Amino acid sequence: KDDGAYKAEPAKGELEFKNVSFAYQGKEELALNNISFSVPAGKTVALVGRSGSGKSTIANLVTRFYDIEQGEILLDGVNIQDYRLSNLRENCAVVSQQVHLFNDTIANNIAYDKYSREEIIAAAKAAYALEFIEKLPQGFDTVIGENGASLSGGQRQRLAIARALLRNSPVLILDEATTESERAIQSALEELKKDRTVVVIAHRLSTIENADEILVIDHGEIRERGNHKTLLEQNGAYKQLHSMQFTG
Amino acid sequence: KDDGAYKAEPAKGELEFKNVSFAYQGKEELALNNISFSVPAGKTVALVGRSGSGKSTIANLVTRFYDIEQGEILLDGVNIQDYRLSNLRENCAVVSQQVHLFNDTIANNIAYAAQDKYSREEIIAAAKAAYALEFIEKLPQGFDTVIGENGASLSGGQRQRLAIARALLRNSPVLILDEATTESERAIQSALEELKKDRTVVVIAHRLSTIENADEILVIDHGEIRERGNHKTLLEQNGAYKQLHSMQFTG
Ligand SMILES: [Cl-]
């Protein structure tokens, strides 16, 4: 599995899927069928589509959660399978509700290459988490409880963003859920998304409407491609999903 | 990190903490202070206590989420650090507040579990024992149903039972169960009673049914074990357990 010996320190962040097909183990039918798209370094691409579309499979493949046998996924023009897995994962950070927190200090949860307290604070500030952390009796040295359940969900999402900002990965995979601090998160995500390549499993209207490109995934294929304005003009699948607020 | 060359295939499941102390990196204060307890193979031990107690740190240490430098944690009398990490993790399964699910079939999500491959028949047996068979078989594609949104297509009760099925399939001799402080709550309680049979169980506990049926309860308070017993012996003491129990383990 971890056969690759090549590394990018850091990668510029250019992504490309070229003729990618994928089927789950034990299934003949394809989950993804001849997927091709390119994301220039520093751009944001929102994957939208109904549940079951395969949009999440596309995102999962970027970090080799599973490998393909047909087509290629390239990072800076090199097949992702050719990179040392640890380096691929260092270059491509994931943010999802599945962010693992654990009993330890807030600082250590953010730091989970060593970073200084200064660097950790800067990451929390950019993530709109500094204000709630510093008001706490012990600040960054506060020990979280119940492996993260002591914090609110909005607080947990911002720690996940801080953790991502600290690593400063050139590629970000953001999985949006279909919040009391929602405004703060949107600003935090706008900071996280700046100067890096972002692939979003998207549900927020603000994320989608501001993406450089939107790919509408439908039964394992790309049905429509454009941005919010060009896709609305088409009066097709994007426009309909948008009307229903990406709740499909 | 993964310096150990020893393996148990499988371990019997005897656990022991002997004089264990632990502090988070960069902290002077101890998170756990001179923790000592034994769990004979096949017994269930419930760790109870208020948020911040360190009960979850105890559970996290069993699978080497972090390592100690004072005292020892032993599996079948061998320090956990001496086992190949992959084998320690094969012997000690975790049912976490949040189990990692992903776009793929229900069967592949259940099988994600162990090192060796399992048959469809073995996967079905695991789902049955976990009270997940009925909801999976009523579905249009049954076990071949592809979950969506990396698990969000399923209900939370359904996701917990898949985590239990996943644990039953690997049949690990040690189970670490983290209870959250449900529409299919009854089904889960029976599923957990199946999962807890014939294996060593360490529970970060909140359910009254789990706690009242544990072989031993350890009340953790500010990084120390304050009380030890079972539901009946601890109630007799009219102390910390009784008070926590009176508030339904919501602390
Ligand atoms: Cl420092």
For residue B50, the one-letter residue type is R
Contact A151, A159 (CB under 8 A): yes
Which value in Å is the resolution of this experimental model?
1.8
Q: Report every protein residue that has its C-beta within 5 angstroms of ion ligand 1.
A: A 116-117
Contact A55, A192 (CB under 8 A): no
Taking a contact as any Cβ pair under 8 Å apart, which residues of chain A between 135 and 194 contact chain B?
Answer: 141, 143, 145-150, 175, 177-178
Contact B99, B150 (CB under 8 A): no
From chain B, the residues in CB contact with A102 under 8 A are: 56, 60, 65
Half-sphere exposure (CA, 13 Å, Cβ side) for A166? 27
Bridge pairing between strands B15-22 and A221-226: unpaired
What is the set of domains in chain A, with CATH numbers? 1-248 (3.40.50.300)
Contact B203, B179 (CB under 8 A): yes
Beta bridge partners of B177: B95, B203
For tokens 């607020």, the residue is A245
- Residue B72 Ramachandran class (φ > 0 left, ψ -120 to 50 alpha, else beta): beta
CA-CA distance, B182 to A23, in Å (whole number)? 34
Give the 3-state secondary structure of chain B: CCCCCECCCCCCCCEEEEEEEECCCCCCCCCEEEEEEEECCCCEEEEECCCCCCHHHHHHHHCCCCCCCEEEEEECCEEHHHECHHHHHHHEEEECCCCCCCCCEHHHHHHCCCCCCCCHHHHHHHHHHCCCHHHHHHCCCHHHCECCHHHCCCCHHHHHHHHHHHHHHHCCCEEEEECCCCCCHHHHHHHHHHHCCCCEEEEECCCHHHHHHCCEEEEEECCEEEEEECHHHHHHHCCHHHHHHHCCCCC
From chain B, the residues in CB contact with A98 under 8 A are: 98, 100, 150
CA-CA distance, A165 to A193, in Å (whole number)? 9
- What technique solved it? X-ray
Give the sign of the dihedral formed by CA B94, CA A25, CA A198, CA A8. positive
Contact A163, A192 (CB under 8 A): no
Select the residue of B60, B96, B180 nearest A103 (Cβ to Cβ).
Answer: B60
What phi and psi, each to the nearest 5 degrees, are found at residue B217?
A: -120, 130
A201 SS3 class:
strand
CB proximity B49 to A under 8 Å: no
CA-CA distance, A105 to A179, in Å (whole number)? 24
CA-CA distance, B39 to B214, in Å (whole number)? 12
From chain A, the residues in CB contact with B104 under 8 A are: 24-25, 66
Say yes or no for a CB contact (<8 Å) between B108 and A24.
yes
- Residue A64 Ramachandran class (φ > 0 left, ψ -120 to 50 alpha, else beta): left
DSSP type of residue A94: E
Select the residue of A53, A146, A178 nearest B181 (Cβ to Cβ).
Answer: A146
Beta bridge partners of A21: A70
